[PDB]
Amino acid sequence: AKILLDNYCFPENLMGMQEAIEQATKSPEILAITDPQTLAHVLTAGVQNSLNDPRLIISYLEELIEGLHNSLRHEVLEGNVGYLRVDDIPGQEVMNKLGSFLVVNVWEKLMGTSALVLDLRHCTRGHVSGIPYVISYLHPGNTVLHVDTVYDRPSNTTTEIWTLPEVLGDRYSADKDVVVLTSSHTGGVAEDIAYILKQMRRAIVVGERTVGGALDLQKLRIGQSDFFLTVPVSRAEQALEKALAILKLRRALPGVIQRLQEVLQEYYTLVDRVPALLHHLASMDLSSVVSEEDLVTKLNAGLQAVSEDPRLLVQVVKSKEAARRALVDAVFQVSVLPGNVGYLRFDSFADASVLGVLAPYIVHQVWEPLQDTEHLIMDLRQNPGGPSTAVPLLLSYFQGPDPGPVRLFTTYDRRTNVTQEHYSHTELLGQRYSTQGGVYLLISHRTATAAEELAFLMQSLGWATLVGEITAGSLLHTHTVPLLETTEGGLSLTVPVLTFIDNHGECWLGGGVVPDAIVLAEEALDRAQEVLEFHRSLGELVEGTGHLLEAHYARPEVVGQTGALLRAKLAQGAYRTAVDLESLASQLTADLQEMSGDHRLLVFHSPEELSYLIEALFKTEVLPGRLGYLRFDAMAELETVKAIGPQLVQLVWQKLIDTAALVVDLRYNPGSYSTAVPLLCSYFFEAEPRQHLYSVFDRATSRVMEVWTVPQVAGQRYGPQKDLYILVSHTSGSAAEAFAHTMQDLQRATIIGEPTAGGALSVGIYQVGSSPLYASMPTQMALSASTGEAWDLAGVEPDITVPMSVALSTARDIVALRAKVPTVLQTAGKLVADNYASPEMGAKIAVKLSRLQSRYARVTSEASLAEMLEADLQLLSGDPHLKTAHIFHTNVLEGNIGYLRFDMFGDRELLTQVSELLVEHVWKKIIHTDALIIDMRFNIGGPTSSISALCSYFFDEGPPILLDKIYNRPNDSVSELWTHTKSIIILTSSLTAGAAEEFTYIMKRLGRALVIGEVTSGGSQPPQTYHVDDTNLYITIPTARSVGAADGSSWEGVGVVPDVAVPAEGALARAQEMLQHTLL
């Protein structure tokens, strides 16, 4: 084992472990370890087991054409398929003498085949330089890509596959497919050939998984004989035609969907969603499918997903006069079950024609004894049925509630494209058995098709209810279409043909009907008898419920229609689907809640210790900022509240007497006893007057009661002016609801939290005449003090809607903002007095703004104070510019007339750099024109410093004539406007900004130009935003009022009105009309 020490030195499995094995070195007489023949087989189960290596074996010019030619055989097989074989892997030096022959002759015949297969079973050994070329021949592309992890120890360089462009002629087409073949005899060199292809996904692998070992194994021969080394230094027989079968199927996979698209959209039955269907039919990938079994699985999943109807029929796995009336009475058996109940059993539906021609015997035998039955039961458990042609005839006998003809079911056939309405046959020769009293169908899991249709039709129309197990769901309205059968394939597809839209207009996909009583098939008869026994008293329960609801309900206006609706439902028999008491109770609850609009109505079937208790119940603390946090965990007493008196008032109430702000924690209060609530409310209001809190209306007393505050309960009253806050959550009880309503109606608190559902002021459970059923209904109602309307019936609507966990922080923010309100008003008034267009008007605003303290003391929250302050400022000052918030073209017209238009403003410094540009841009085209037209109807706005530039550019050089005096309050002075040392008419509109019209204004004072258009927007100077100490207020203050005008009546607010009013779109057309005439 001296060779092994140097050749194989990979640390991934050695780390020098063989150095200990190297210590054996010669070891020529170590047979004592094991006898000669093995001890290599022992090492096969020894070191090789510890190595965990891919196998280890130790034992005890025409000339090149001739050798290679025997290694391959290429021919065109059926289906236009090429076969390739190889036993010696080529090398770089080989193609220097053999590559031309491979491409001239062998490769030419390969490209003429639609599919190619390569064989690697007989590959044993070869060089490494041959693999980059075989992939290059196979790879359609020309870009070099390297994806490989293999390294050779003597080369000391990692090897990655390279697709060289050295190939001669056209490469393999990307459209055609190839498959690799391998076996146990496949060599390592051929193993990585398939390994790269599988990762490339270009080809597919067939047959048994190969060894997957090292690509090459180093060989060495020393000693006398009997052993040559094969150390790895470099790190199912039927599959020949199996791929051909795959290729043949793959040859038809381009055509596997053409027929499927043809048969699917034949008619409207299955293509109700055809825009999605046809789109997805071409979306299936032919590379993913690799086998016939896999083809079935992928097509089935895709077909169900696109149609969104998985339960419907889908793709299926491929395939490899005496005797006459004697019979009439024999097929149909009728018995008088005790209790005057008719029993009917069916075995087969026969045919509609047979029943039509044998009707008189059939009716004379079955309906003559069945006419006297109070209730009828049908036992079709043992009835496959078969044809469904006679279904409408049987349904005609059961006329239903309405004797008039009515459609039962609508059927549409794909083959005929005919929609037929099945009206109730009213010419039957029978006694017309009525559905009154109920008919019950006993259905097993063997109803098959016709009986199952009859049962489903009975259930849908409501004329019957089903007792028994679920149905099989098998249906005969389905045709299996052939689809691509060849040799052993035999694929098959089944497609539904009938739609069978019911009376409700909902298509019945089929597959099984759920009965109203899931009971074992054997136990169906006793269950049906029990349902008979229960259904005899259905009317009594409904009548009792109606009478009770009339007797003890707070709102009679609801009862006036509730009684009628319940009676109408009972008369028709819509409750026949109830099988047990609980189901009937649930249905009654659903009906009452859905039509009465009330969700509270419900029906269902069957010393030191005092101090410790009160301290455990309450959580009293004074939060920072002088505000209380009294919490009512559970307080729903009647007289013990006034019984305890001082022992609790001194301990709890006397501590929070001087809080100056009180917060009630009603989030956790399941108390639902609105009995002594007004006593608690009387503390907050004024003692001397009798304040009407709310009025309660009692049905039993049948008149409206009034609730008044207690004149005197204790000497510690909270106080009227001091604020209050109430916190309500979704789990709040009934008492807290009443407290919140009575504080919100009188406008005493500010409810913060989330809406709470369920008032239930006072509920009392009453029992109907029958024991098992109890009714829970609100026997009380409260009317508001302000108006006679009842309460919201759904709970309070908090002014601030926040989750119950964050409610306390919101209350803290609210009280902080309320405390901050007066300072905000004071500083806003001071700022307005300081800066404004009119100093006297600003002083008046500041004086008057201080008188709105009372109105601002009840602000709901932030961002409403801002809007209400804006409204107050805008009503105080006629300027609508007081807002508050919270966090170049040139043309020449006809007749020698110039044109100008611009709507954006920039700073004088900004225009200084571009001042030179505009001289040769806007003035070059207008220097020669007789007249000018200027438009600013779409002006956006900007600073007023650019005014002087506009006047200076327009005016000719000379002594300054411009005169404008403007009071600048931030400057605390007045500034005069001076200019920098034909005809023109202004085009204005309402969209002109507040920075535009002053240009128009100064034009009309000097008389140089006239103005055409309509009224301006009444803007102002660009307001200077201001920041208040509160972060939520940005006050905008107009200033720099134009006062230098002799008249003293500013354009502000009112705007500028031109001489003649014209529309903005017509103003431009009207702009040049008079210019032409005045030059005409």
Author numbering: 32 to 91, 110 to 284, 309 to 393, 417 to 702, 721 to 1001, 1031 to 1124, 1135 to 1233
Pull text from the paper:
The shuttling of insoluble retinoids across the IPM involves the retinol-binding protein 3 (RBP3), which is a large approximately 140 kDa glycoprotein, present in almost all vertebrates. RBP3 resides mainly in the IPM, and it transports retinoids, fatty acids such as docosahexaenoic acid (DHA), and other hydrophobic molecules like retinoic acid, cholesterol and alpha-tocopherol, between the RPE and the photoreceptors, playing an important role in the visual cycle. Based on molecular characteristics, RBP3 consists of four tandem homologous modules of approximately 300 amino acids each, but elucidation of the three-dimensional structure of the intact multi-modular RBP3 has been largely evasive. The binding of retinoids to RBP3 protects the photoreceptors by preventing photodegradation of the retinoids, and it regulates their transport across the IPM.
In the current work, we have determined the structure of the RBP3 protein from the porcine (Sus scofa; pRBP3) retina at a higher resolution, using cryoEM. To obtain an intact RBP3 structure, we used pRBP3 in the presence of CHAPSO, without antibodies or fab fragments (when tested they were detrimental to obtaining good-quality particles). The map sharpened with one b factor (−179.4 Å2) was resolved at 3.67 Å resolution (according to the Fourier Shell Correlation (FSC) = 0.143 criterion), with both flexible arms of the structure being smeared. The local resolution map analysis revealed that the stretch from domain B of Module 2 to domain A of Module 4, inclusive, displays good parameters and could be refined de novo (accordingly, this region was used for the description of the structure analysis); the maps for the remaining portions of RBP3, at both termini, allowed only rigid body fit. The map displays the four pRBP3 modules, which adopt a ‘pi’ shape fold, similar to the bovine variant, and have good density for the connected alpha helices that bridge the individual modules. The long module-connecting alpha-helices are bent after turn three, with an angle of approximately 39° and overlap with a root mean square deviation (rmsd) of 0.38−1.12 Å. Each module consists of two domains that are bridged by a disordered linker, not visible on our density maps. Domain A is formed by a three-helix bundle followed by a small β strand (using the first 80 residues of the primary sequence) that forms a three-strand anti-parallel β-sheet by the contribution of a two-strand insertion from 20 residues in the middle of domain B. This domain is responsible for binding fatty acids; but on our maps (due to the resolution and/or the ligands being washed out during purification), no density is visible at the binding sites. The pRBP3 primary sequence also harbours seven cysteine residues, five of which could be modelled and do not engage in disulfide bonds.
